[PDB]
Amino acid sequence: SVFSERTEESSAVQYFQFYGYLSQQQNMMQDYVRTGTYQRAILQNHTDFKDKIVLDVGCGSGILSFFAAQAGARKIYAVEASTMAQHAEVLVKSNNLTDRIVVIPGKVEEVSLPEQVDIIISEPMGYMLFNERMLESYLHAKKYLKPSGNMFPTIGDVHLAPFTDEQLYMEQFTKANFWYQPSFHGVDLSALRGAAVDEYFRQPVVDTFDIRILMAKSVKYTVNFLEAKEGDLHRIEIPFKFHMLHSGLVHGLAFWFDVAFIGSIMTVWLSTAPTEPLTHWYQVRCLFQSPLFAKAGDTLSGTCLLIANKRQSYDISIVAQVDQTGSKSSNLLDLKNPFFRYT
Amino acid sequence: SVFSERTEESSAVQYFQFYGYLSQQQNMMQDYVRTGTYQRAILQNHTDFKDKIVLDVGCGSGILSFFAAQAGARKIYAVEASTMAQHAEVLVKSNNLTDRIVVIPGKVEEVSLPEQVDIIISEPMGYMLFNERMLESYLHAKKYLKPSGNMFPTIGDVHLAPFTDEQLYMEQFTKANFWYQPSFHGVDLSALRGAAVDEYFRQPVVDTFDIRILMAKSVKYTVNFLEAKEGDLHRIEIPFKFHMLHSGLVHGLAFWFDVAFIGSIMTVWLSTAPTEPLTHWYQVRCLFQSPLFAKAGDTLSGTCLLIANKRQSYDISIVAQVDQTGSKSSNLLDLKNPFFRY
Amino acid sequence: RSVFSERTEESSAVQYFQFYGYLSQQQNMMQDYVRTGTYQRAILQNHTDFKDKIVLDVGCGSGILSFFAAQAGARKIYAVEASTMAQHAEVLVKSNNLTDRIVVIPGKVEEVSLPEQVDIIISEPMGYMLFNERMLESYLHAKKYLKPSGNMFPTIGDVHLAPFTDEQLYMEQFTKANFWYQPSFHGVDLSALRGAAVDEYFRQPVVDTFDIRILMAKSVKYTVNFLEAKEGDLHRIEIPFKFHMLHSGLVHGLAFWFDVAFIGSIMTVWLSTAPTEPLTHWYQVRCLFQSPLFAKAGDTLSGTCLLIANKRQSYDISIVAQVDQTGSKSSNLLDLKNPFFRY
Amino acid sequence: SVFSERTEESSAVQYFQFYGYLSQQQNMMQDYVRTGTYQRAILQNHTDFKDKIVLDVGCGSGILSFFAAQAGARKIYAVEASTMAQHAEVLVKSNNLTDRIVVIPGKVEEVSLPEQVDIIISEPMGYMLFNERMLESYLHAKKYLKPSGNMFPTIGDVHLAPFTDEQLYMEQFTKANFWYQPSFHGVDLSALRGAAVDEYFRQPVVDTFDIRILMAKSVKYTVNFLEAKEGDLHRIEIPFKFHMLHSGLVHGLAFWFDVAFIGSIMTVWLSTAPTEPLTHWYQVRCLFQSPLFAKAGDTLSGTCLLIANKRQSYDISIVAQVDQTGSKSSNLLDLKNPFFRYT
Amino acid sequence: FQNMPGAIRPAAP
Amino acid sequence: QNMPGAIRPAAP
Amino acid sequence: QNMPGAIRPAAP
Amino acid sequence: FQNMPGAIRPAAP
């Protein structure tokens, strides 16, 4: 299947094992921003659900399907590939909704759905939006969508902005300099110091930060879920040219994302920006290998190139340059294995 | 191979991916109790290494091989299955020890060695001692051990004692009670509270605690590495009969372990007991879903059954009973998926 | 057949009046200096409402309020008391040389015969949470003896309800119920009754005081005007509420207290049991939710408190509360007659 | 029935409502002295139960019946008059014991059993043993006992001893002296002081004490449940002739009780004595209206007369004199309404 | 005490 | 302190 | 520092 | 973090 062809089996085993835990459902459900916003988007656009056929891709415990039922949906197909599907079926029965919600265990790329649907709902966002490659499963489900059907969320914006964080940058060398000693219990560790450094710089940093470290307005890369094909997410090239609002050393790029639920009655926004209340997605920062000095009014231009891999994630290639000085840096990071730095 | 037959492929990928990270070598190396105690056992038993042939099973960055080299070994075969073997080879060259340390990349169950060895060294202890199923690899390596060859560590002691900790119990119970809500955003979750309690209490709790929570003297279960066979660790049965020293609620059993390096000059002990300085193994506690009330002088009897699984860990079965009242508790725990509380 | 016996199980009435036959219980109420001092203030500062007037004292106990009416210059005071405390009141009337002004009439006010209509009725008809004891109905029933121009002391009653957060109280009760979760109590599985035990414990309203900082929204007020109300008005008391949450957090229940006002000709005097005021022997009353509701500041918590009078001289309490923004709903039923005295 | 002819309906209603609470089952069950000893008495005499027919009188939640089953009983009839019978039925089902335990809701004086039994088990002890008059129901149940049958408990001992407690005695006048003031808010209360004193002295005191307050060896009054008849408990005369071990003022008599389970294998004792671990029965002290001075070696003779009443308790009449001096004191107490003094 | 069925008014503080 | 209706004392 | 199987971060 | 799959050795203290 499409999912098997793009995913190493060992990554998939561990991925769905994670999502088999009720504690992980609980983690996401207790994110009031996440859960409350989805609920508001669905209920405030009840006309998009009233008497409609709905597909819920990756339903977990089924909360979004219950929200679609609260909004008057006629029939809701909930697809979930982890063992959480069995727990969802328990919730459907205990909530007396077996007539309206059908739980279908399995991957959306492999299950058979008997009907075309009026609207697809899902929470396919990983950290930095694209991790997990669940957006491609969400887009793949459009084979079940009627023409002129809708998608909730309807669009995803990923935002990129340059940041300055001297302490974060220097922390990488303080940790790697553990290896720069000539007699650790009589052993010279120095020869591995460079490898230690490279290892830390390949890790994106998942945590939050003060918005005052941002040095330019973000650049936005929009994915329109109604228009896009899943092939669009295999290679994502995000050009940027930041107009620097502050002067100082740029140590890397900071990432967050928004999604919009574009309903017939209103549009509702779920945001993970650092200007908004913190969510379980936090934000993500990728360091440059070397900082770039940029005066306010200079332009920082480059590309962030996301290349999907068979570990349900992306390799991140960042190149950046201060146009007015020609100073360049880059880095190559493994999104699958970030450093969770939040305290 | 023996390793392949007993291990899910996807568990091994993730397992050895973890050990390929230099930051994880740093993590264990910076445990000074751990590294310093290993160095002391080897150097103070330098006679067990002087001009000896050595096998280092799971050498990581090779630190134990360097200790064997400092203690006078003639040749050390350092076997490591993760990509860390490449970094160990770098360190051997930079420390000018190529004539004495030979890194053999691979699984100890699969590689060939040129000759039998006088002594095997390794750090096979996971948390609760048995996690990782590395003790079996360690014992498997005895096929390369000469008759009357030694092993460092030589024996491993598991200790289990009943504990009382209302706070820990109610912390985990509260988490599970999320699934007791009848109207979470209007949705009845209570049908899953049973399953939630099961899931949360399958998780051993890795952290440290004050010794004052122990309600009886520990029972010891010993694995003699010089004698044990691989198959002795597939199904480990640990009976216990605690004599309760204090009255109160028994919320579970606490676990720790000591290993001894029984060398020719002295025995050196590496302990993870809550009475000793803290290590990166901490201690491990297994909770009962409902605690048992016991009076001082009562006996708590039962069996802890460790059954090895294909994910390089153990399914833990604990059955416990207050003999005087017949109050029983049974729990199944997934050693692979703990809750790191520290 | 008397109005009292028609609405009261005799078994309840025997126990009820036995309690009030004890001098130790009169001392308990009399030593509440806020209670006794406020009643005396309300009567003496409105002495013109009593000077040369005919007074009815309903449920006079040992007679203290009748003595206050006498100090204010009442011409005649009929003091009705159904417990054996009436005989002790007679002793105090004689030893205080007030036989010419205070006439004790033993019995229930629904059953005695008063010699004449009165200018003013005084009473202490307030139980905990105001409504317990159903003495308010006896107070209103006594208006058959009140002149058209008459007054009531107290004149009105205000019940306040506000949502509260108190994790400690909630877990204290839930911990007791959890005894019945044990699967092997002396080898016996009790867990089949855990549901019944939770229901039983959370059926008890909690009588104690608390810090006002546990209140999460301004209180709602329900007013009973004793001059206007009729007995039958108190058979079914419906208190809708719509709280505007001032703080985020878990709503563990509703907290109750009451004020009464003595609306005299000279001034109005208030007797408050509010948690912002000095503590009385009524304390305050909290009704817990079996599962607390999560609410954000700015959300609205709406529902109704329904009190159904029962034959045990108390009310069956039904509380239904809903977080409007999320549809998180909690329904509870409490037995006001059998509270947990926690203080 | 025998029960209704000796019990006022209002007493019975409140009595069985108290026992309808799971919280009150739990209160007794958590008394480990009480529950553990019953389990030890039954299990250590397993041959009195193996393959036998048992009757459990006043079984509450049924725990004694589950102990009889643990001991191997073939058929247990468990009789309980409160609504707790419904919960016992749930427990019998959930413990998969419906084949062996049959719950019979009702008063043991009114139900029908299908056959005679080999042994009766019960907890008929109230505080001071005799409160609740449940011993009569236990003795009444012997109409279902086979000629050779046994009873668990088999006998009960009540112990009486004189005590000195100057502070407990003076406490009564401190409390009553509330009424001895000439102007409580302008009212002379002093005429009720004597009645208040009488009220306090009529209350048995339920709490524990140091055994050093006892001034003579205890006298023992024994009820043999195998031989006694219901009527023997309507009038209980306990003569005493204490030989004083210490000189001092005797302020009253202290009461406690032991029961013995006399089995084929061994006798097990459940003691509420002040020399033993405290139980929920505590101990019971009855004050004298006036203390009696006794020298060590003097004799304190008298009688404690317990007269059963229709409130499922006893009127207590105690008369005592110091033989060497003629100094005499008495008291009349209402066992149904004790003062709980334990803190 | 969890249940005082006969206590009509709470004990004063 | 008084225990009106409490047939058995609260356990200790 | 290395949390290989944590797909979603733990909520704050 | 309630579930740290892949963390084989606990983080040092």
Ligand SMILES: *CCC[C@H]1O[C@@H](n2cnc3c(N)ncnc32)[C@H](O)[C@@H]1O
């Ligand atoms: C962040 C949301 C993850 C959520 O979706 C499920 N999931 C992931 N990939 C899936 C495919 N291909 N089909 C069905 N469900 C799928 C995860 O298991 C989790 O519940």
Ligand SMILES: *CCC[C@H]1O[C@@H](n2cnc3c(N)ncnc32)[C@H](O)[C@@H]1O
């Ligand atoms: C606790 C440290 C274990 C250590 O040993 C390595 N390891 C694990 N399993 C192995 C087999 N079968 N052969 C060789 N090395 C092996 C881990 O990678 C880690 O470094």
Ligand SMILES: *CCC[C@H]1O[C@@H](n2cnc3c(N)ncnc32)[C@H](O)[C@@H]1O
């Ligand atoms: C809160 C104090 C109430 C007080 O009034 C007496 N009482 C209660 N109900 C009564 C009726 N129906 N008639 C007369 N007195 C009545 C209580 O005994 C108590 O003293």
Ligand SMILES: *CCC[C@H]1O[C@@H](n2cnc3c(N)ncnc32)[C@H](O)[C@@H]1O
């Ligand atoms: C001390 C506990 C008494 C226990 O027995 C029940 N009870 C009391 N009187 C009873 C009669 N006559 N028949 C059956 N059960 C009876 C109490 O309800 C309590 O459970």
